[PDB]
PDB file of C-alpha atoms in Angstrom:
ATOM      1  CA  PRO A   1       1.918  -2.800 -16.247  1.00 23.57           C
ATOM      2  CA  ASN A   2       2.150  -6.578 -14.491  1.00 21.18           C
ATOM      3  CA  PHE A   3       0.510  -6.335 -11.155  1.00 20.18           C
ATOM      4  CA  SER A   4      -2.459  -8.852 -12.581  1.00 18.46           C
ATOM      5  CA  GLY A   5      -1.689 -11.616 -10.327  1.00 19.97           C
ATOM      6  CA  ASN A   6      -2.046 -12.678  -6.536  1.00 17.01           C
ATOM      7  CA  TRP A   7       1.539 -11.934  -4.383  1.00 14.91           C
ATOM      8  CA  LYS A   8       2.809 -13.391  -1.439  1.00 14.70           C
ATOM      9  CA  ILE A   9       4.458 -11.476   0.937  1.00 11.75           C
ATOM     10  CA  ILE A  10       8.343 -11.183   0.489  1.00  9.94           C
ATOM     11  CA  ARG A  11      11.082  -9.319   2.551  1.00  6.26           C
ATOM     12  CA  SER A  12       9.191  -7.061   5.102  1.00  6.01           C
ATOM     13  CA  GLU A  13      10.232  -5.050   7.503  1.00  9.33           C
ATOM     14  CA  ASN A  14       9.029  -1.703   7.941  1.00 11.80           C
ATOM     15  CA  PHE A  15       6.247  -1.794  10.433  1.00 12.31           C
ATOM     16  CA  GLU A  16       8.755  -0.091  13.857  1.00 12.39           C
ATOM     17  CA  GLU A  17       9.942   2.373  11.471  1.00 14.59           C
ATOM     18  CA  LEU A  18       6.176   3.443  10.882  1.00 14.26           C
ATOM     19  CA  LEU A  19       5.337   3.992  14.788  1.00 14.92           C
ATOM     20  CA  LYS A  20       8.659   4.931  15.123  1.00 13.83           C
ATOM     21  CA  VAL A  21       9.115   7.797  12.096  1.00 14.74           C
ATOM     22  CA  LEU A  22       5.810   8.913  13.194  1.00 16.45           C
ATOM     23  CA  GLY A  23       6.968  10.071  16.223  1.00 19.58           C
ATOM     24  CA  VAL A  24       8.448   7.470  19.032  1.00 17.13           C
ATOM     25  CA  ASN A  25       7.060   8.075  22.424  1.00 18.06           C
ATOM     26  CA  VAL A  26       6.197   5.458  23.936  1.00 18.29           C
ATOM     27  CA  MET A  27       5.162   3.291  21.181  1.00 19.03           C
ATOM     28  CA  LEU A  28       8.646   1.554  20.849  1.00 21.95           C
ATOM     29  CA  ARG A  29       6.972  -0.762  18.173  1.00 24.18           C
ATOM     30  CA  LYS A  30       4.220  -0.581  20.278  1.00 23.67           C
ATOM     31  CA  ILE A  31       4.888  -3.746  21.818  1.00 24.30           C
ATOM     32  CA  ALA A  32       2.657  -5.504  20.095  1.00 20.97           C
ATOM     33  CA  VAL A  33       2.916  -5.174  16.041  1.00 21.11           C
ATOM     34  CA  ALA A  34       5.324  -7.047  13.952  1.00 21.61           C
ATOM     35  CA  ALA A  35       3.997  -9.878  12.407  1.00 23.27           C
ATOM     36  CA  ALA A  36       1.471 -12.894  13.636  1.00 22.08           C
ATOM     37  CA  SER A  37       0.313 -14.179  10.764  1.00 17.52           C
ATOM     38  CA  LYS A  38       0.916 -13.994   7.265  1.00 15.38           C
ATOM     39  CA  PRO A  39      -0.367 -10.606   5.063  1.00 17.00           C
ATOM     40  CA  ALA A  40      -0.726 -11.863   1.525  1.00 15.68           C
ATOM     41  CA  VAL A  41      -2.899  -9.713  -1.123  1.00 16.53           C
ATOM     42  CA  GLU A  42      -4.373 -10.528  -4.964  1.00 16.55           C
ATOM     43  CA  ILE A  43      -4.144  -7.626  -7.507  1.00 17.89           C
ATOM     44  CA  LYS A  44      -6.878  -8.378 -10.531  1.00 18.25           C
ATOM     45  CA  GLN A  45      -6.168  -6.040 -13.595  1.00 17.45           C
ATOM     46  CA  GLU A  46      -7.221  -5.154 -17.016  1.00 15.07           C
ATOM     47  CA  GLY A  47      -5.312  -2.565 -18.623  1.00 13.65           C
ATOM     48  CA  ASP A  48      -5.209   0.757 -17.044  1.00 11.59           C
ATOM     49  CA  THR A  49      -8.213  -1.047 -14.224  1.00 11.16           C
ATOM     50  CA  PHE A  50      -6.939  -2.467 -11.634  1.00 11.40           C
ATOM     51  CA  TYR A  51      -8.481  -4.236  -8.212  1.00 10.38           C
ATOM     52  CA  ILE A  52      -6.005  -4.767  -4.594  1.00  9.24           C
ATOM     53  CA  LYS A  53      -7.016  -6.598  -2.376  1.00  8.52           C
ATOM     54  CA  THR A  54      -4.575  -6.801   0.781  1.00  5.07           C
ATOM     55  CA  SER A  55      -6.161  -9.225   2.994  1.00  7.78           C
ATOM     56  CA  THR A  56      -4.123 -11.731   5.732  1.00  8.52           C
ATOM     57  CA  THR A  57      -6.674 -14.267   7.275  1.00 10.64           C
ATOM     58  CA  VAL A  58      -9.997 -12.142   8.249  1.00  9.08           C
ATOM     59  CA  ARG A  59     -12.334  -9.629   6.642  1.00  8.70           C
ATOM     60  CA  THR A  60     -10.333  -6.913   4.672  1.00  8.26           C
ATOM     61  CA  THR A  61     -10.900  -3.889   2.080  1.00 11.33           C
ATOM     62  CA  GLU A  62     -10.071  -3.616  -1.067  1.00 11.24           C
ATOM     63  CA  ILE A  63      -9.305  -0.769  -4.295  1.00 10.16           C
ATOM     64  CA  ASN A  64     -11.233  -1.911  -7.156  1.00  4.42           C
ATOM     65  CA  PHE A  65     -10.329   1.372  -8.842  1.00  3.42           C
ATOM     66  CA  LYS A  66      -8.903   2.083 -12.307  1.00  4.64           C
ATOM     67  CA  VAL A  67      -5.714   4.018 -12.182  1.00  5.63           C
ATOM     68  CA  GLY A  68      -6.046   8.050 -13.391  1.00  7.95           C
ATOM     69  CA  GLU A  69      -9.060   7.866 -10.620  1.00  8.23           C
ATOM     70  CA  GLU A  70      -9.022   8.366  -7.053  1.00  6.38           C
ATOM     71  CA  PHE A  71     -10.851   7.047  -4.092  1.00 11.04           C
ATOM     72  CA  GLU A  72     -12.117   8.082  -0.949  1.00 13.80           C
ATOM     73  CA  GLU A  73     -10.714   7.698   3.269  1.00 15.28           C
ATOM     74  CA  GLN A  74     -10.551   9.041   6.937  1.00 18.06           C
ATOM     75  CA  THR A  75      -7.156   9.284   8.364  1.00 13.23           C
ATOM     76  CA  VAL A  76      -7.144   8.340  12.155  1.00 12.79           C
ATOM     77  CA  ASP A  77      -8.101  11.627  13.827  1.00 11.71           C
ATOM     78  CA  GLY A  78      -7.978  14.883  12.790  1.00 11.36           C
ATOM     79  CA  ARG A  79      -9.403  15.525   8.759  1.00 13.86           C
ATOM     80  CA  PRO A  80     -10.500  13.334   6.199  1.00 11.41           C
ATOM     81  CA  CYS A  81      -8.823  11.889   3.020  1.00 11.88           C
ATOM     82  CA  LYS A  82      -8.838  10.597  -0.232  1.00  8.75           C
ATOM     83  CA  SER A  83      -5.642   8.834  -2.695  1.00 10.87           C
ATOM     84  CA  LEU A  84      -5.156   8.589  -6.419  1.00 10.42           C
ATOM     85  CA  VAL A  85      -3.260   5.935  -8.146  1.00  8.87           C
ATOM     86  CA  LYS A  86      -1.441   6.797 -11.346  1.00  7.39           C
ATOM     87  CA  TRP A  87       2.420   5.456 -12.896  1.00  6.07           C
ATOM     88  CA  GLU A  88       6.206   6.271 -13.211  1.00  3.43           C
ATOM     89  CA  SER A  89       7.377   4.738 -15.941  1.00  3.92           C
ATOM     90  CA  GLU A  90       4.778   1.635 -16.744  1.00  6.90           C
ATOM     91  CA  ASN A  91       5.315  -1.054 -14.246  1.00  7.05           C
ATOM     92  CA  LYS A  92       5.901   1.433 -11.276  1.00  9.86           C
ATOM     93  CA  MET A  93       2.543   2.570 -10.119  1.00 11.38           C
ATOM     94  CA  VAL A  94       2.022   5.062  -6.619  1.00 11.32           C
ATOM     95  CA  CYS A  95      -1.027   6.010  -5.087  1.00 12.92           C
ATOM     96  CA  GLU A  96      -0.583   9.967  -3.396  1.00 10.95           C
ATOM     97  CA  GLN A  97      -3.056   9.621  -0.546  1.00 10.94           C
ATOM     98  CA  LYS A  98      -3.729  13.533   1.350  1.00 10.80           C
ATOM     99  CA  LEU A  99      -5.977  14.352   3.693  1.00  7.65           C
ATOM    100  CA  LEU A 100      -7.397  17.490   1.240  1.00  7.34           C
ATOM    101  CA  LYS A 101      -5.500  19.554   3.476  1.00  7.19           C
ATOM    102  CA  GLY A 102      -2.234  17.579   5.216  1.00  6.70           C
ATOM    103  CA  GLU A 103      -0.862  19.152   8.495  1.00  7.36           C
ATOM    104  CA  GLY A 104       2.683  17.383   8.223  1.00 12.04           C
ATOM    105  CA  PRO A 105       3.482  14.049   6.531  1.00 10.16           C
ATOM    106  CA  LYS A 106       1.003  12.142   4.415  1.00  7.35           C
ATOM    107  CA  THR A 107      -0.531   8.479   3.209  1.00  6.40           C
ATOM    108  CA  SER A 108       0.321   7.152  -0.035  1.00  4.96           C
ATOM    109  CA  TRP A 109       1.555   3.833  -1.832  1.00  5.87           C
ATOM    110  CA  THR A 110       3.637   2.872  -5.203  1.00  3.75           C
ATOM    111  CA  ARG A 111       3.325  -0.521  -6.028  1.00  3.38           C
ATOM    112  CA  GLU A 112       6.315  -1.911  -8.671  1.00  2.00           C
ATOM    113  CA  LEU A 113       7.090  -4.747 -10.376  1.00  2.00           C
ATOM    114  CA  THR A 114      10.731  -6.306 -11.678  1.00  2.00           C
ATOM    115  CA  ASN A 115      11.337  -8.522 -14.478  1.00  2.00           C
ATOM    116  CA  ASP A 116       8.457 -10.918 -14.053  1.00  2.00           C
ATOM    117  CA  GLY A 117       7.503 -12.177 -10.309  1.00  2.00           C
ATOM    118  CA  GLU A 118       8.711  -9.530  -8.129  1.00  2.00           C
ATOM    119  CA  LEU A 119       6.399  -6.837  -6.963  1.00  2.00           C
ATOM    120  CA  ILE A 120       7.683  -4.579  -4.229  1.00  2.00           C
ATOM    121  CA  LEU A 121       4.854  -2.448  -2.791  1.00  2.00           C
ATOM    122  CA  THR A 122       5.174   0.755  -0.609  1.00  2.14           C
ATOM    123  CA  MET A 123       2.778   2.562   1.138  1.00  2.45           C
ATOM    124  CA  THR A 124       3.710   5.567   3.258  1.00  4.29           C
ATOM    125  CA  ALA A 125       1.829   7.244   6.162  1.00  4.75           C
ATOM    126  CA  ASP A 126       2.183  10.318   8.652  1.00  5.70           C
ATOM    127  CA  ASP A 127       5.644   9.600   7.265  1.00  6.74           C
ATOM    128  CA  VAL A 128       6.155   5.987   7.738  1.00  4.87           C
ATOM    129  CA  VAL A 129       6.516   3.450   4.974  1.00  3.13           C
ATOM    130  CA  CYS A 130       5.244  -0.181   4.368  1.00  3.11           C
ATOM    131  CA  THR A 131       8.127  -1.549   2.141  1.00  3.42           C
ATOM    132  CA  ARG A 132       7.953  -5.200   1.337  1.00  4.61           C
ATOM    133  CA  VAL A 133       8.598  -7.622  -1.828  1.00  6.77           C
ATOM    134  CA  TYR A 134       5.945 -10.033  -3.406  1.00  4.41           C
ATOM    135  CA  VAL A 135       6.466 -12.665  -6.038  1.00  2.00           C
ATOM    136  CA  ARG A 136       3.614 -14.403  -7.768  1.00  2.00           C
ATOM    137  CA  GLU A 137       1.763 -16.989  -5.837  1.00  2.00           C
TER     138      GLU A 137
END
């Protein structure tokens, strides 16, 4: 499946599309969101077991799970929400995150590999989608 390896940012332009698809209404790129530092990440996996720490400079969270299982979490406001990682082909995995009910859109993310150093990881959320290619540091 690949994935095991740190990942540098490569091609990223969806942040505004996130605050623009959730329902633009004075948000307009939230006049603040864009890119001030370098949002890096580091994956650590052993077979079907995977770990994912997406940080940038300050503290952050990471999912030390193993594909075939779900995690837990909470949305911004409304109801709670868990997640669940799976596969697609063998080097492309997903992570459908739901709020145990869903009202309209939903959250989720799919990490995919390419050639041998092009990890494109997407991550939707409330109809938004953060898609950016990565490479192995």
